[PDB]
Amino acid sequence: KSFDAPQWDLWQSRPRSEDMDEALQPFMDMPKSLKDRRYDIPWWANPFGAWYLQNILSLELLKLKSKTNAEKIATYRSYMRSLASGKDNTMSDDDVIRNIIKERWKTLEFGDRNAGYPCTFGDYIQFLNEWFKSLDEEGMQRLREHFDRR
Amino acid sequence: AEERLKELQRAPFKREKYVSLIQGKYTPKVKKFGYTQHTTVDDFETKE
Amino acid sequence: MKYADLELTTRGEFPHGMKEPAFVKKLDQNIPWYFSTYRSMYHWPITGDNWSDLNEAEKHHDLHMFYTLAWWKLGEGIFGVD
Amino acid sequence: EGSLEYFESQYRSAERAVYDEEGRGVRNYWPSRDAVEGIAQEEENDAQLLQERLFNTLETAGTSVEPWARNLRLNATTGKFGYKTEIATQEEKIYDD
Amino acid sequence: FRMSGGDMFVEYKVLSRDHRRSIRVEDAIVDPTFKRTVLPLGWLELLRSPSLRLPTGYFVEETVHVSLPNEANAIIAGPVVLYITGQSVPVVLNPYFVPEGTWDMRTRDGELDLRLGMDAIEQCTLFSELRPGGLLYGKLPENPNVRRNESLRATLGRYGMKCDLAESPLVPRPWTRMRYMFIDELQRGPKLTEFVGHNPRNGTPWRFSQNTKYFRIGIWRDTIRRNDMNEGLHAHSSWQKSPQQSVPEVRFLAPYP
Amino acid sequence: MEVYRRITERVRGALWAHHGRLMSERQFHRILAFVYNNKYEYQIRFDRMEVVGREWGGRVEVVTTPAGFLKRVRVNPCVEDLTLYQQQQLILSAYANACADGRKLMEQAEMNIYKQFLKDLKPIVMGIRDNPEFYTVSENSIETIGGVLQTGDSNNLCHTHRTIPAAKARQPADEVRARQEWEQKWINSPRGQSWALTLRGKTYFALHGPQYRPRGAPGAKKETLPLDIPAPYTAMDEKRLLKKNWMAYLDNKHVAEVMWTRVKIADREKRQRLLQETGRAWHRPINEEAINRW
Amino acid sequence: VEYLTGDITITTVMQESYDALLDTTPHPHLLTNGFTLESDAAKYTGEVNKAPLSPLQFRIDMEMNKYRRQQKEEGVVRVPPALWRLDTSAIVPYKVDSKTRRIVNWREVKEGIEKSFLSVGLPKEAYTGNEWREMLYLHDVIANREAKAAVLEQQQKLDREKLKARERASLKGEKSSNSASNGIGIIFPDKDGYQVFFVDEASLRPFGIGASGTLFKAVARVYPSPAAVPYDDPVHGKQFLIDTTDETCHLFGGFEHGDRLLLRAKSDEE
Amino acid sequence: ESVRYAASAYVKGRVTLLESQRTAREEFMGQVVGIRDGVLFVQWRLLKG
Numbered sequence A: 001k002s003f004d005a006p007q008w009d010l011w012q013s014r015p016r017s018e019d020m021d022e023a024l025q026p027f028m029d030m031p032k033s034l035k036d037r038r039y040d041i042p043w044w045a046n047p048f049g050a051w052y053l054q055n056i057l058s059l060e061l062l063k064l065k066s067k068t069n070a071e072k073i074a075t076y077r078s079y080m081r082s083l084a085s086g087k088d089n090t091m092s093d094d095d096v097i098r099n100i101i102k103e104r105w106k107t108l109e110f111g112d113r114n115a116g117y118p119c120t121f122g123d124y125i126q127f128l129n130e131w132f133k134s135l136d137e138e139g140m141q142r143l144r145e146h147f148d149r150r
Numbered sequence B: 001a002e003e004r005l006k007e008l009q010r011a012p013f014k015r016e017k018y019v020s021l022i023q024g025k026y027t028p029k030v031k032k033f034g035y036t037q038h039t040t041v042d043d044f045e046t047k048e
Numbered sequence C: 001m002k003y004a005d006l007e008l009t010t011r012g013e014f015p016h017g018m019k020e021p022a023f024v025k026k027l028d029q030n031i032p033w034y035f036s037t038y039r040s041m042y043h044w045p046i047t048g049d050n051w052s053d054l055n056e057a058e059k060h061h062d063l064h065m066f067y068t069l070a071w072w073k074l075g076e077g078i079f080g081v082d
Numbered sequence D: 001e002g003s004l005e006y007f008e009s010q011y012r013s014a015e016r017a018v019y020d021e022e023g024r025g026v027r028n029y030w031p032s033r034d035a036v037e038g039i040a041q042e043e044e045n046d047a048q049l050l051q052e053r054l055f056n057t058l059e060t061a062g063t064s065v066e067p068w069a070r071n072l073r074l075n076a077t078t079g080k081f082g083y084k085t086e087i088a089t090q091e092e093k094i095y096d097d
Numbered sequence E: 001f002r003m004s005g006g007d008m009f010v011e012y013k014v015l016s017r018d019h020r021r022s023i024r025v026e027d028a029i030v031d032p033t034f035k036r037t038v039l040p041l042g043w044l045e046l047l048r049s050p051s052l053r054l055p056t057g058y059f060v061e062e063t064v065h066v067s068l069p070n071e072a073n074a075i076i077a078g079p080v081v082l083y084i085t086g087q088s089v090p091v092v093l094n095p096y097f098v099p100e101g102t103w104d105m106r107t108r109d110g111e112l113d114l115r116l117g118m119d120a121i122e123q124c125t126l127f128s129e130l131r132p133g134g135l136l137y138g139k140l141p142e143n144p145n146v147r148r149n150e151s152l153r154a155t156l157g158r159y160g161m162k163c164d165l166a167e168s169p170l171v172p173r174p175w176t177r178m179r180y181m182f183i184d185e186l187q188r189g190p191k192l193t194e195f196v197g198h199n200p201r202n203g204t205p206w207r208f209s210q211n212t213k214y215f216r217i218g219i220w221r222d223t224i225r226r227n228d229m230n231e232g233l234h235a236h237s238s239w240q241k242s243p244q245q246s247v248p249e250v251r252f253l254a255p256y257p
Numbered sequence F: 001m002e003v004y005r006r007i008t009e010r011v012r013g014a015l016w017a018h019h020g021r022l023m024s025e026r027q028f029h030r031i032l033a034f035v036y037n038n039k040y041e042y043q044i045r046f047d048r049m050e051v052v053g054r055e056w057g058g059r060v061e062v063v064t065t066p067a068g069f070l071k072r073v074r075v076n077p078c079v080e081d082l083t084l085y086q087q088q089q090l091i092l093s094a095y096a097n098a099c100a101d102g103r104k105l106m107e108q109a110e111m112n113i114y115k116q117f118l119k120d121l122k123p124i125v126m127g128i129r130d131n132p133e134f135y136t137v138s139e140n141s142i143e144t145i146g147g148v149l150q151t152g153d154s155n156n157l158c159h160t161h162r163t164i165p166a167a168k169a170r171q172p173a174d175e176v177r178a179r180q181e182w183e184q185k186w187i188n189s190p191r192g193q194s195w196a197l198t199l200r201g202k203t204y205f206a207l208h209g210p211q212y213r214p215r216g217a218p219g220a221k222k223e224t225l226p227l228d229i230p231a232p233y234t235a236m237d238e239k240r241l242l243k244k245n246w247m248a249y250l251d252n253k254h255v256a257e258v259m260w261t262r263v264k265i266a267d268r269e270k271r272q273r274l275l276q277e278t279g280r281a282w283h284r285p286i287n288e289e290a291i292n293r294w
Numbered sequence G: 001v002e003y004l005t006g007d008i009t010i011t012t013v014m015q016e017s018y019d020a021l022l023d024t025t026p027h028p029h030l031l032t033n034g035f036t037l038e039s040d041a042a043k044y045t046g047e048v049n050k051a052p053l054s055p056l057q058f059r060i061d062m063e064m065n066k067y068r069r070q071q072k073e074e075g076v077v078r079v080p081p082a083l084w085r086l087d088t089s090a091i092v093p094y095k096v097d098s099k100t101r102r103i104v105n106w107r108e109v110k111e112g113i114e115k116s117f118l119s120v121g122l123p124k125e126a127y128t129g130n131e132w133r134e135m136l137y138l139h140d141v142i143a144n145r146e147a148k149a150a151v152l153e154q155q156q157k158l159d160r161e162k163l164k165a166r167e168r169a170s171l172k173g174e175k176s177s178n179s180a181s182n183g184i185g186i187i188f189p190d191k192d193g194y195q196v197f198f199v200d201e202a203s204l205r206p207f208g209i210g211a212s213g214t215l216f217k218a219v220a221r222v223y224p225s226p227a228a229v230p231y232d233d234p235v236h237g238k239q240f241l242i243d244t245t246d247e248t249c250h251l252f253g254g255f256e257h258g259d260r261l262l263l264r265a266k267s268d269e270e
Numbered sequence H: 001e002s003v004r005y006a007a008s009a010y011v012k013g014r015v016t017l018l019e020s021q022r023t024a025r026e027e028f029m030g031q032v033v034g035i036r037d038g039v040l041f042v043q044w045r046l047l048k049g
Helices: A047-057 A069-080 A093-106 A121-133 A137-149 B002-009 C033-037 C056-071 D003-018 D041-061 D067-078 E125-130 E152-158 E213-224 F002-018 F025-046 F084-129 F172-187 F190-195 F199-208 F238-244 F246-277 G012-024 G039-045 G055-074 G107-118 G129-170 G201-207 G246-250
Strands: E002-004 E007-015 E022-030 E038-040 E060-064 E074-078 E080-084 E091-093 E096-098 F051-055 F060-065 F069-075 G185-190 G193-198 G215-222 G229-233 G238-242 G261-264 H002-005 H024-036 H039-044
Touching: A047 A093, A047 A121, A047 D067, A069 D003, A121 C056, A137 C056, B002 G129, D003 D041, D041 G055, D067 G055, F002 F025, F002 F084, F002 F246, F025 F084, F051 F084, F060 F084, F069 F084, F172 F190, F199 H024, F238 F246, G055 G107, G129 G185, G129 G193, G185 H024, G201 H024
Parallel strands: E038 E096
Antiparallel strands: E002 E007, E007 E022, E007 E080, E060 E074, E074 E096, E080 E091, F051 F060, F060 F069, G185 G193, G193 H024, G215 H024, G229 G238, G261 H002, H024 H039
């Protein structure tokens, strides 16, 4: 056996067919006896899927800092008619919202979830693997576009 | 007739308030120019 | 779907492709010319529409793309709003 | 449209809130600190209206959802999962190929 | 393509194969009751252009009964190109050339009563007019597979259509299928294209990585004394001193960096 | 093409000269594109018809689409006896008088296009001069680093014109709303009730009611209030560029400045020529202090 | 094209095999017939017996996602009316064969979800009188749209047969040329479809307008206000403002003004 | 109990009770078409919108 750190690409060098049955590598390497013990449950019962559901997908639970009346007025009159020299920020609550989301992706950390953080790493790539196998044609097209862009 | 039936079934919804379900949202959403989502103009679009 | 609570202790390091390699002092062949002298048979990118039953281009590209997306955690925190 | 409508509505409210706060009817350029930094109660009332209709009818219809699913979804939205770590047998860990 | 009286009228242009000779037809019925399109026999000699590849004007010239329009009463002649006004793609017929006696369409004064059959409908955008909901669907010959009077949403409803397009939140909306479009000139510039191999087409775009035999001593000398310039083949590697590494599709004309 | 692009550059340049607004290249080209497509439409429809030029007596006839294409030629057997040279010249001159008639038609068409184009520019142009801050000084008044000097002569000859009512604003929009107020006032009156049953009335309703256009019929289905693009009050292309990259900002403002200068030079050339034609100006510089003494 | 030609057909064998594999393989959003229950999934699900998806909760989350979507796209949501309630009546849960531990009705479930989701949530009193009226009318108009199409096509065949019969068997001698073939009949669109109108001297002349091409101006006697027409009834002792319009009356089942209508009364009287 | 059209939809009874009250003279531009069951058909031209 080779005891150096695991490569994630090993499937490309070896002609083993159980590989291609699953997306990510550590699940390709998984014995059948263990794969038997993964049980099918709703996608949000996967703690990472839960995290994704709460933070990203649920807008309704997102609260924004409420604007004062002065702020409401200055903002409105900025939006409707532009006069130069003004504060360049005037940030759309759309931009703000998307900033809060992207920093929610920043602040997401994995680990033991009896400690602080929401997800095991294994938990995360597990949801990821279930999802990558789950892709349609236009699904993985959207994926590859997303990948080419970012 | 089908589309008009759809309008009528959704007609009581059109009489209520607009309210953001993100509370603390004020600034309007931008709808850009030429996006297919936003085109209201039917030049020749008949039932046919 | 198909969830178990699994412990994965060691993931190998990031596939950024750039890691300081193992350093040596002496080398086996002391003959650097072999680097510049080496040729190979031609790599032809395509033959006749490039059809294959194993779909190689598509499949291999996606498989690389998957663990790449995994490691960058979908590139989702990196970009703010310009 | 409908962003703009809401937007314009809350502006109208905020400004007739600031400029005449007491509803006397005349324009006041020296407003109290409470009317300037004060938040509109209409925002809160709108949240409470959504609560009263949309979410309430959703929990009402969610009454007859079978118990494990409610308890599980509750675990999800809270974030606490009692889950026992599946332990790979020595044969699935060290002695596996 | 225009509508009247319940049916289509299309302008088209008949042509020999080398496009030496041509005939316009202004209003032709699009009728899918004709297995194959019919022309007056007289045109056979008008459209015959004897090129090099076809020493006689046509590749196929034979006699068929052709009793469908109205024992060899007609002639199958191919291949004659046909350009319909709506379509970008030429349609290539092997039509029935009919004499006067077999069928005479003089029908109204100056009017030749020509029509287009499924020979030419199969090859156009016109074909999509043949499916349920289209404008030729009424005129399909009766089948078990084609129900005459059904409403469209009734039919599609049987095939499994439930709601309107992307109405359920589970199906992504059609227009987010394509969000970004990549045009090198408008953003970030062109790629830096290298090769290792014989040609640009015969090699790989990739250089060799740091783990190469010949690159290790060099890269070492380059890590230790960073500021002085170092000999080696370690230059050719994908890895180097500068923050900008050599890997494929570096955009080198981009303003930043 | 030329007559249009000159006016559009006039607009872009002026837009940046008077207020700090830039027009997006996208916009600038899409104006012109709309003119072009207009011409194209007029062509599409012009080819469905024919113009007939005729030479000597009626015995040489030439049938040609207004674009100058030749469809038919009829000729008397008289012509057949002339000469190849004279036959050619005859037919060619008939063709010429045909192209003449066609070109008369087309030039009316083009006048029409120019009018539509102007009408489409008007919210922009009248967008920039209809503001409470817009002003101009006479072209013959000296300009110095502080401000502009007063032209001395004929204190009667300088009249400042004003486009804006100085009391509370009456905008074009209020005028359109006034127009539909009068439409409804007329319609809903008894005499108007009887008029709406006439042929004139139904002509009016067929042309100018959009509200009654059946779903899917071409054309606007509501009556539109006139576009308002007040120039100093609407940020256009300079704010996006200033947020994104300074370099493109400097380049686009540079383009606008250059265009404005160019326009102004053209106006100076036309002025000079009109001045020479009427003999107030010489053909070479005779006054060099008007140039060298600055 | 082969399907529309009749050449290729979907058979019962193809159909049922199609259904077989549609049952026995994994569906992306739903549990499928031929999904095996796992005893030990209780470690997570919390229950040993039942199926690890609840169609009711799935529907609910679909509603939630519908609103989250309308918000993501338009920035704002319309608050549902107070008379609005989600209809859960059409939803049935997963049934499991105890012996083989599989899900028997997958299709019953899917049909349930779709049928519930499509249904609008609000009753009759959430509407204006006019709105409810027009809605009923339009239901009937579709459901009959089919059969009316049928009847119409039949009568069209009858009309054309009558035309070619009428032109052929009247006179062949004067109707073979151009004046009589253009002359005897026209196919032209009518309110319900392309119909056949008879153009003839003997047919047209009682009306005092020349022929099928005649242009004309006319002056007609109309109600000054067809919206409100003041009929006085001695019998009921009533003042009646009656609305003679095509639309308002169309709403009532399509009956227009001036329509000759047989009705037998129910308590035979026609 | 039952409603059915006498003859065809387009054959129209004369409404006498409202006939005396038709007042306004209104103008039309149109084109003759044909005859179905003695009923004259017309195509109107100036048409709203």
